[PDB]
Amino acid sequence: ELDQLRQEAEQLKNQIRDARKACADATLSQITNNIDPVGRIQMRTRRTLRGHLAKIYAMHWGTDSRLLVSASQDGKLIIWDSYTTNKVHAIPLRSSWVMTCAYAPSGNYVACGGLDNICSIYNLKTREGNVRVSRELAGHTGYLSCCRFLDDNQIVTSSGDTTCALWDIETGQQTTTFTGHTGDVMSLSLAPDTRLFVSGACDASAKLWDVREGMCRQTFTGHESDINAICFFPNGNAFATGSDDATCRLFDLRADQELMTYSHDNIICGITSVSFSKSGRLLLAGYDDFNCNVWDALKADRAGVLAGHDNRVSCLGVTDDGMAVATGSWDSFLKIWN
Amino acid sequence: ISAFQAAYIGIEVLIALVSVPGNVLVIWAVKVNQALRDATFCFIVSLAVADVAVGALVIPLAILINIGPQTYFHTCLMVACPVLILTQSSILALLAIAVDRYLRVKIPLRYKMVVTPRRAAVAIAGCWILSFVVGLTPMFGWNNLSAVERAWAANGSMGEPVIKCEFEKVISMEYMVYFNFFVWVLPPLLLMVLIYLEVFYLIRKQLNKQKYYGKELKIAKSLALILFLFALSWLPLHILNCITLFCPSCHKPSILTYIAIFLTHGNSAMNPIVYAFRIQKFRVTFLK
Amino acid sequence: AAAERSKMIDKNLREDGEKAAREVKLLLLGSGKNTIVKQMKIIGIVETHFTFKDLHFKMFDVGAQRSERKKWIHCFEGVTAIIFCVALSAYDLVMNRMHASMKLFDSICNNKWFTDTSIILFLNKKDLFEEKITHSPLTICFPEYTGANKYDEAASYIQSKFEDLNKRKDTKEIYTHFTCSTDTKNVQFVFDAVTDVIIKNNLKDCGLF
Amino acid sequence: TASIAQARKLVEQLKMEANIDRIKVSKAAADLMAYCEAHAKEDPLLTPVPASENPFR
Numbered sequence: 001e002l003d004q005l006r007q008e009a010e011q012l013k014n015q016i017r018d019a020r021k022a023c024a025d026a027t028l029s030q031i032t033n034n035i036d037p038v039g040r041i042q043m044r045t046r047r048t049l050r051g052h053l054a055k056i057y058a059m060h061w062g063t064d065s066r067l068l069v070s071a072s073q074d075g076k077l078i079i080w081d082s083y084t085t086n087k088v089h090a091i092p093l094r095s096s097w098v099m100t101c102a103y104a105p106s107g108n109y110v111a112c113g114g115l116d117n118i119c120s121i122y123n124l125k126t127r128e129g130n131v132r133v134s135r136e137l138a139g140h141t142g143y144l145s146c147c148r149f150l151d152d153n154q155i156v157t158s159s160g161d162t163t164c165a166l167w168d169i170e171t172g173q174q175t176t177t178f179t180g181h182t183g184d185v186m187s188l189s190l191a192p193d194t195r196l197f198v199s200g201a202c203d204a205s206a207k208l209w210d211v212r213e214g215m216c217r218q219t220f221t222g223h224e225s226d227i228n229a230i231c232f233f234p235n236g237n238a239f240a241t242g243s244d245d246a247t248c249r250l251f252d253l254r255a256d257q258e259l260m261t262y263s264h265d266n267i268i269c270g271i272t273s274v275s276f277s278k279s280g281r282l283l284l285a286g287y288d289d290f291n292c293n294v295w296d297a298l299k300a301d302r303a304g305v306l307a308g309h310d311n312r313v314s315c316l317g318v319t320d321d322g323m324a325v326a327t328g329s330w331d332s333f334l335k336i337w338n
Numbered sequence: 339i340s341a342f343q344a345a346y347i348g349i350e351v352l353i354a355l356v357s358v359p360g361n362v363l364v365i366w367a368v369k370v371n372q373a374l375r376d377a378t379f380c381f382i383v384s385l386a387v388a389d390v391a392v393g394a395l396v397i398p399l400a401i402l403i404n405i406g407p408q409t410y411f412h413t414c415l416m417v418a419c420p421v422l423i424l425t426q427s428s429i430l431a432l433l434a435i436a437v438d439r440y441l442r443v444k445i446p447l448r449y450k451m452v453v454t455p456r457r458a459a460v461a462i463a464g465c466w467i468l469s470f471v472v473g474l475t476p477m478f479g480w481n482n483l484s485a486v487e488r489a490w491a492a493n494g495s496m497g498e499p500v501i502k503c504e505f506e507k508v509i510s511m512e513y514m515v516y517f518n519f520f521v522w523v524l525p526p527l528l529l530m531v532l533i534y535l536e537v538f539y540l541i542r543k544q545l546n547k548q549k550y551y552g553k554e555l556k557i558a559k560s561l562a563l564i565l566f567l568f569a570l571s572w573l574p575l576h577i578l579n580c581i582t583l584f585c586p587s588c589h590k591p592s593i594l595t596y597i598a599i600f601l602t603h604g605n606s607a608m609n610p611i612v613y614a615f616r617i618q619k620f621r622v623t624f625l626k
Numbered sequence: 627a628a629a630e631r632s633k634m635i636d637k638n639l640r641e642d643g644e645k646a647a648r649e650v651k652l653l654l655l656g657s658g659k660n661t662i663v664k665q666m667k668i669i670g671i672v673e674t675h676f677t678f679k680d681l682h683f684k685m686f687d688v689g690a691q692r693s694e695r696k697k698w699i700h701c702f703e704g705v706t707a708i709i710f711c712v713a714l715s716a717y718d719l720v721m722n723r724m725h726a727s728m729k730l731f732d733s734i735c736n737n738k739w740f741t742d743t744s745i746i747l748f749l750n751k752k753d754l755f756e757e758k759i760t761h762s763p764l765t766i767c768f769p770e771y772t773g774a775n776k777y778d779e780a781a782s783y784i785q786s787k788f789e790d791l792n793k794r795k796d797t798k799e800i801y802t803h804f805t806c807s808t809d810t811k812n813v814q815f816v817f818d819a820v821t822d823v824i825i826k827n828n829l830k831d832c833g834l835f
Numbered sequence: 836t837a838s839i840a841q842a843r844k845l846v847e848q849l850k851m852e853a854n855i856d857r858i859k860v861s862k863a864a865a866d867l868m869a870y871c872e873a874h875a876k877e878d879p880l881l882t883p884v885p886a887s888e889n890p891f892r
């Protein structure tokens with residue numbers, strides 16, 4: 001029973017597409033024409049965090065909007081202090097290749113994952129002394145392309161072996177496993193509810209996962225290439241995805257379809273990272289042509305351009321109070337923008 | 339004010355107007371970029387700073403000297419000294435670049451640990467302070483002040499001498515030819531020739547350890563162009579000064595001296611194309 | 627106050643960077659990889675370290691990656707050399723393993739991240755090849771071939787095909803060595819090829835090249 | 836037996852995610868518009884703030 005079951009699958013997918021077009025009343029541009037436009041935003045560079053020798057692969061702020069963790073290829077995980085450009089800690093790493101880093105929302109743990117299939121959990125207080133390897137989480141057969149903290153106790157990690165996972169730290173085991181992609185899972189974003197997390201994959205599909213259940217509530221297929229990075233709209237009802245086909249898309253959870261497409265005729269380069277501001281009005285998209293584009297996330301117009309770099313930007317973080325936007329590139333300079 | 343001097347001023351202004359943008363462009367392309375902060379690029383920045391200094395200051399001062407407004411002696415010495423101060427720094431920067439280019443091929447495995455940009459900055463600072471010493475030696479007291487004061491007393495006047503400011507009369511030929519040409523211009527030339535022949539021997543050995551012949555011919559042509567450029571730009575004026583010193587009865591035209599001087603300044607225009615432009619990284623940064 | 631610890635950490639980063647920058651990083655690609663690893667094994671990613679004639683080498687084996695190559699590959703940009711190992715005896719076995727290896731070689735050669743990086747090509751297992759060339763002919767893989775069954779012309783034709791797959795001319799070099807079971811010869815070839823790459827890199831940096 | 840099982844899991848999950856309902860797009864887009872207009876006050880990138888409150892001066 002393969003052919004008739006496949007026909008059933010295709011009929012059900014056609015029915016889902018029909019429902020999505022049934023609930024599609026009108027385009028978002030027609031109703032959001034009545035919004036006052038943004039205009040033009042250029043940002044001043046305020047810092048330049050120069051302490052890395054190799055390419056900076058990923059960053060993540062803290063909830064203080066003061067400390068940020070940067071991870072580079074030369075084996076350094078540095079907790080920069082963005083106010084007075086200090087280095088609070090510099091952690092040496094077992095594997096030089098580190099493709100992600102995370103900072104615990106209370107500011108007590110730093111997690112990093114690379115090509116060694118091993119997430120690492122470094123504690124920061126450590127009344128015995130300096131920073132120490134606290135726990136090593138190893139259950140994947142792919143590169144850990146992104147990891148995030150739910151709290152100080154359990155960590156959700158994506159991977160390259162087609163599986164997201166939820167890990168407990170005090171035990172060291174997969175508390176649950178999220179399966180059901182086709183390609184490599186490039187990035188996951190958490191909702192502020194910490195109950196639902198999206199994840200973008202290499203099969204041109206972004207899937208939403210519930211933490212307690214373990215199942216795909218919703219699945220979005222609208223891209224022509226692989227999805228590099230993904231980030232929720234700040235309220236928890238939408239998320240934007242960036243792909244290598246020079247398009248950013250905004251997917252809505254309620255209407256279950258794509259809202260809008262950011263694609264410009266002068267751009268033929270892929271998106272490396274996306275983010276939103278605090279109000280959800282600016283979609284910040286890093287690119288491969290060495291600069292950042294600030295998009296009006298309602299009227300689909302390019303608000304500005306941030307071209308302070310020399311090589312392509314690999315990470316783009318925004319503080320939790322919306323003060324400053326730190327873009328980190330392969331020339332090892334974290335440019336902080338306001 | 340004469341026609342020959344007018345031709346000299348026109349060629350000097352042309353050399354200035356060509357040499358200033360090239361050097362500003364080299365300093366620009368290094369500043370904007372972060373990938374061009376290696377030791378050899380610190381040396382090329384040193385040469386470009388000395389070179390824009392030549393193009394900006396020495397050529398107006400040279401035109402001022404050759405026109406020759408009458409002034410006091412010590413004022414004319416204060417005007418004629420930064421010429422030597424900047425040209426000697428140009429020659430020493432050329433020498434430093436050649437020594438670096440030797441070290442890259444002589445010890446290629448452990449080059450990064452030997453020549454760090456801190457040691458590069460120390461060597462550049464040493465070259466500049468020695469260029470200030472060599473330049474400021476006439477001000478320290480070795481000039482034709484004694485001869486001018488003797489002639490001034492002979493004519494009967496008293497006070498500081500008011501003379502038509504002209505470079506041959508104010509400064510002693512013995513300093514120009516013995517100290518400058520023997521001690522600090524000829525050993526850089528001979529040392530660059532020795533270093534570049536040694537670099538060519540090392541490259542020939544490495545390549546032999548028709549395509550190789552073509553690559554070897556290109557490297558040899560580049561080295562010979564550098565050495566010929568340096569020895570063509572500097573040596574005529576100094577040979578003229580030397581023959582003026584040794585045989586004073588040897589009578590030479592003025593236009594010969596003027597051609598020698600604008601070749602000496604022509605080196606300042608020629609240096610960016612020969613040195614910075616041949617690097618692939620610099621052409622990449624220029625085009626982008 | 628905090629600037630004291632900031633400058634201490636700056637000093638430690640600078641010292642660690644000076645220590646790390648002297649070492650040579652090599653990328654392995656495969657079939658005969660185990661021979662090379664066990665030969666020069668003196669001292670996810672399998673990382674091995676060995677020190678030969680005042681050089682430190684870190685070799686990285688990427689063979690345990692069951693993922694898309696196009697994703698992790700740009701991490702390894704900036705290595706000195708790519709040790710690419712080909713089994714000569716794979717012309718007969720299976721589509722064809724020799725064509726699979728040539729396709730991988732074409733992919734890494736025409737990969738946009740490795741325009742500068744030189745490939746050290748190891749054609750391994752010469753003995754099994756010299757037996758199997760008298761055993762079986764090369765009509766299987768190559769239609770345009772003349773010296774049907776002889777080790778010398780067979781090996782030279784395989785080498786010529788691989789080096790001919792290089793589309794970029796004079797930007798990078800391909801160094802070919804038939805793998806010797808004699809001690810120190812493989813490591814010696816690696817050292818000579820890395821030394822040549824370092825000298826060419828310095829000459830290109832001067833503009834003298 | 837493995838391929839049909841993978842396709843079985845695919846179809847069962849696909850029917851499971853198909854069984855939910857979907858809100859019309861204009862209402863949810865107006866909700867996102869309302870959220871943006873609500874929090875348009877405290878966004879320092881959209882709404883510019885001078886060097887008084889800015890900790891990066």
Ligand SMILES: Nc1ncnc2c1ncn2[C@@H]1O[C@H](CO)[C@@H](O)[C@H]1O
Pocket residue numbers: 400421422425426505506514575579595599602603
């Ligand atoms: N005979 C000379 N007449 C005028 N200037 C001279 C003479 N010899 C050397 N110089 C000056 O010295 C500089 C080189 O040190 C020349 O660029 C030139 O300005």
